[PDB]
Design an enzyme around this catalytic site. Structure first.
Site, PDB file in Angstrom:
ATOM      1  N   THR A 267      13.418 -17.683 -61.182  1.00  0.00           N
ATOM      2  CA  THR A 267      14.778 -17.157 -61.306  1.00  0.00           C
ATOM      3  C   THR A 267      15.734 -17.865 -60.350  1.00  0.00           C
ATOM      4  OG1 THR A 267      14.115 -15.449 -59.889  1.00  0.00           O
ATOM      5  CG2 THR A 267      14.249 -14.882 -62.276  1.00  0.00           C
ATOM      6  N   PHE A 392      19.846  -8.024 -59.642  1.00  0.00           N
ATOM      7  CA  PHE A 392      18.595  -7.851 -58.936  1.00  0.00           C
ATOM      8  C   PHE A 392      17.966  -6.490 -59.234  1.00  0.00           C
ATOM      9  CE2 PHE A 392      20.785 -11.027 -56.256  1.00  0.00           C
ATOM     10  CZ  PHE A 392      19.836 -12.013 -56.308  1.00  0.00           C
ATOM     11  N   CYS A 399      14.907  -6.114 -56.577  1.00  0.00           N
ATOM     12  CA  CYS A 399      14.279  -7.356 -56.154  1.00  0.00           C
ATOM     13  C   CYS A 399      14.056  -7.350 -54.646  1.00  0.00           C
ATOM     14  CB  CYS A 399      15.180  -8.545 -56.463  1.00  0.00           C
ATOM     15  SG  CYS A 399      14.439 -10.147 -56.079  1.00  0.00           S
TER      16      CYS A 399
HETATM   17  C1  HEM Z   1      18.104 -15.352 -58.228  1.00  0.00           C
HETATM   18  C2  HEM Z   1      16.894 -15.006 -57.977  1.00  0.00           C
HETATM   19  C3  HEM Z   1      16.272 -13.743 -58.424  1.00  0.00           C
HETATM   20  C4  HEM Z   1      16.628 -12.831 -59.347  1.00  0.00           C
HETATM   21  C5  HEM Z   1      17.796 -12.947 -60.289  1.00  0.00           C
HETATM   22  C6  HEM Z   1      15.638 -11.792 -59.350  1.00  0.00           C
HETATM   23  C7  HEM Z   1      15.687 -10.646 -60.156  1.00  0.00           C
HETATM   24  C8  HEM Z   1      14.841  -9.540 -60.044  1.00  0.00           C
HETATM   25  C9  HEM Z   1      14.936  -8.343 -60.783  1.00  0.00           C
HETATM   26  C10 HEM Z   1      15.942  -8.061 -61.881  1.00  0.00           C
HETATM   27  C11 HEM Z   1      13.926  -7.508 -60.418  1.00  0.00           C
HETATM   28  C12 HEM Z   1      13.653  -6.097 -60.967  1.00  0.00           C
HETATM   29  C13 HEM Z   1      12.654  -6.165 -62.094  1.00  0.00           C
HETATM   30  C14 HEM Z   1      12.458  -4.891 -62.886  1.00  0.00           C
HETATM   31  O1  HEM Z   1      13.225  -3.948 -62.795  1.00  0.00           O
HETATM   32  O2  HEM Z   1      11.470  -4.846 -63.703  1.00  0.00           O
HETATM   33  C15 HEM Z   1      13.201  -8.208 -59.406  1.00  0.00           C
HETATM   34  C16 HEM Z   1      12.077  -7.716 -58.798  1.00  0.00           C
HETATM   35  C17 HEM Z   1      11.327  -8.494 -57.926  1.00  0.00           C
HETATM   36  N1  HEM Z   1      11.606  -9.736 -57.520  1.00  0.00           N
HETATM   37 FE1  HEM Z   1      13.149 -10.845 -57.919  1.00  0.00          FE
HETATM   38  N2  HEM Z   1      14.752 -12.040 -58.423  1.00  0.00           N
HETATM   39  C18 HEM Z   1      15.067 -13.163 -57.793  1.00  0.00           C
HETATM   40  C19 HEM Z   1      14.399 -13.771 -56.796  1.00  0.00           C
HETATM   41  C20 HEM Z   1      13.184 -13.377 -56.261  1.00  0.00           C
HETATM   42  C21 HEM Z   1      12.493 -14.047 -55.243  1.00  0.00           C
HETATM   43  C22 HEM Z   1      12.995 -15.305 -54.578  1.00  0.00           C
HETATM   44  C23 HEM Z   1      11.304 -13.376 -55.056  1.00  0.00           C
HETATM   45  C24 HEM Z   1      10.226 -13.595 -54.046  1.00  0.00           C
HETATM   46  C25 HEM Z   1      10.365 -14.246 -52.909  1.00  0.00           C
HETATM   47  C26 HEM Z   1      11.329 -12.266 -55.930  1.00  0.00           C
HETATM   48  C27 HEM Z   1      10.358 -11.301 -56.010  1.00  0.00           C
HETATM   49  C28 HEM Z   1      10.582 -10.094 -56.724  1.00  0.00           C
HETATM   50  C29 HEM Z   1       9.578  -9.026 -56.657  1.00  0.00           C
HETATM   51  C30 HEM Z   1       8.281  -9.054 -55.874  1.00  0.00           C
HETATM   52  C31 HEM Z   1      10.037  -8.021 -57.380  1.00  0.00           C
HETATM   53  C32 HEM Z   1       9.320  -6.680 -57.597  1.00  0.00           C
HETATM   54  C33 HEM Z   1       9.918  -5.672 -56.599  1.00  0.00           C
HETATM   55  C34 HEM Z   1       9.325  -4.283 -56.665  1.00  0.00           C
HETATM   56  O3  HEM Z   1       9.110  -3.723 -57.777  1.00  0.00           O
HETATM   57  O4  HEM Z   1       8.962  -3.743 -55.582  1.00  0.00           O
HETATM   58  N3  HEM Z   1      12.477 -12.294 -56.674  1.00  0.00           N
HETATM   59  N4  HEM Z   1      13.770  -9.477 -59.195  1.00  0.00           N
END
Ligand code: HEM
Length: 454
Positions: A267, A392, A399
């Site tokens: 992403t 996010f 996120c």
């Molecule tokens: C522009 C960059 C990014 C965007 C747009 C993004 C977007 C998202 C979104 C929308 C979710 C929620 C998912 C859901 O509701 O099912 C999420 C969860 C998550 N993202 Fe990202 N993300 C980004 C970058 C990152 C990065 C850099 C990492 C790790 C270093 C990461 C790790 C995670 C993790 C582990 C979750 C799960 C969180 C939880 O349920 O506790 N993401 N992200």
């Protein structure tokens, strides 16, 4: 109480044939354009309701009424990401545990410790672009993906993918793309458990093995060096949950490594690619961003504090996330029977999907100019209505990598804008590739060095 809109159905296949396309998210946007703020989407054995207005999304984002749902896509991804953070239910033991063990290593404060390694990879990208000959061009998503993959590898795991030393895809990426593609494809099968698809299953198993062979090398390299480090992997291996006193078990660690390697680069690579697209298509914005970068980044490499001063670059990234949020939909389920928006009765367990790109085009929130790229919308983010902007995700399932992504992207974009002038030499027409996440495909540019030393 109202009847919910629904697009064209195809007998026993319901709405499924509408998304027989390589661009299902963009197809859902066109359906939203026609049917409005909410519509029902049915396939054999499942029903989702897609939400496109801030009015409705603000209710779905109430954590007392809705929790995070594993969408069908996420359920297929769980075939290799298991109960890692992205693919676990909120009620599963390993969600809370891993959240508690890992959250401190991804805080804004932790970014001060990751900064130097982020700069190492960013310098590699800059030097690659400096070394291109005059007849050559930049393949933008390709080089950005090299950067993001290397950044999560080095920051998270002390492991060098060495992406800038490769012109051929890393085996890990080949297998990851193939696994994600199989997940996306499976969504369009009426009966994905049919024996007909046994070949797809055995090949998927081959792709999972390749990913797991990399996880083995990452773990083995850590055991052999010793823990002269405080990164994500350190906390996975040795951290303990304060609530329970337990560490992660071995199997959950493995899923977390897979989760973070993928989530931690794909992403972000989309965001950087879109940002560059919007800058080269909006010269006046590029000019203002370049001027900020030149004024702030006065050192041969950026400091942490300088990155925090790149306010306009931050606004550029947020406006790219407004138009093309690169994780484009998140799912919820009703915790109890309820009524949404005074109009739509839901039963306990009913699924909702927030169609983020369409949410971000709600004219009642953003005004009539919704399609234009205007970073100044984010001059005063306090004034944006609650739950209007959700790149996010939402709440306790938001996120965890948000701080990491934005630090990396701000740093890298700043460096690009300091070091190069850019040319859209092909007059590129936006073509958005979907692999569950979104990213421009075929986007090429030429750079002219400003000849500023590192
Ligand atoms: C522009 C960059 C990014 C965007 C747009 C993004 C977007 C998202 C979104 C929308 C979710 C929620 C998912 C859901 O509701 O099912 C999420 C969860 C998550 N993202 Fe990202 N993300 C980004 C970058 C990152 C990065 C850099 C990492 C790790 C270093 C990461 C790790 C995670 C993790 C582990 C979750 C799960 C969180 C939880 O349920 O506790 N993401 N992200």
């Amino acid at each position: 109480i109202k009847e919910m809109p629904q697009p064209k159905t195809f007998g026993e296949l319901k709405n499924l044939p509408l998304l027989n396309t390589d661009k299902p998210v963009q197809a859902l946007m066109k359906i939203a354009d026609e049917l409005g703020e909410i519509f029902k989407f049915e396939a054999p054995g499942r029903v989702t309701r897609y939400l496109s207005s801030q009015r409705l999304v603000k209710e779905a984002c109430d954590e007392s009424r809705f929790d995070k749902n594993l969408s069908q896509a996420l359920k297929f991804v769980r075939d290799f990401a298991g109960d890692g953070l992205v693919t676990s239910w909120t009620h599963e033991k390993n969600w809370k545990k891993a959240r508690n063990i890992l959250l401190p290593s991804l805080s804004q404060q932790a970014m001060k410790g990751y900064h130097a390694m982020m700069v190492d990879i960013a310098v590699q990208l800059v030097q690659k672009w400096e070394r291109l000959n005059s007849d050559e061009h930049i393949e933008v998503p390709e080089d950005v993906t090299r950067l993001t993959l290397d950044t999560i590898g080095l920051c998270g795991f002390n492991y060098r993918f060495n992406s800038f030393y490769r012109d051929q895809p890393h085996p890990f990426i080949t297998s990851m793309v193939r696994a994600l593609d199989e997940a996306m494809n499976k969504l369009q099968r009426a009966n994905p458990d049919d024996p007909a698809y046994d070949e797809n299953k055995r090949q998927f198993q081959e792709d999972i093995k390749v990913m797991n062979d990399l996880v083995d090398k990452i773990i083995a390299d850590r055991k052999a060096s010793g823990e002269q480090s405080d990164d994500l992997l350190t906390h996975m291996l040795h951290g303990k949950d304060p609530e329970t006193g337990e560490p992660l078990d071995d199997e959950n660690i493995r899923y977390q490594i897979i989760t973070f390697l993928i989530a931690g680069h794909e992403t972000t690579s989309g965001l950087l690619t879109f940002a560059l697209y919007f800058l080269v298509k909006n010269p006046h914005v590029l000019q203002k961003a370049a001027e900020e970068a030149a004024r702030v980044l006065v050192d041969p490499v950026p400091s942490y504090k300088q990155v925090k001063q790149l306010k306009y670059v931050g606004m550029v990234l947020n406006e790219a996330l407004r138009l093309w949020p690169t994780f484009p939909a998140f799912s919820l389920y009703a915790k109890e029977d309820t009524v949404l928006g005074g109009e739509y009765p839901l039963e306990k367990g009913d699924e909702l999907m927030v169609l983020i790109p369409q949410l971000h085009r709600d004219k009642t929130i953003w005004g009539d100019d919704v399609e234009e790229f205007r970073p100044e919308r984010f001059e005063n983010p306090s004034a944006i209505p609650q739950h209007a902007f959700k790149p996010f995700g939402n709440g306790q399932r938001a996120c965890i990598g948000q701080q990491f992504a934005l630090h990396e992207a701000t740093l890298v974009l700043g460096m690009m804008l300091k070091h190069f002038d850019f040319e859209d030499h092909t007059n590129y027409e936006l073509d958005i590739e979907e692999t569950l996440t979104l990213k421009p495909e075929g986007f090429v540019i030429k750079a002219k060095s400003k000849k500023i030393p590192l």
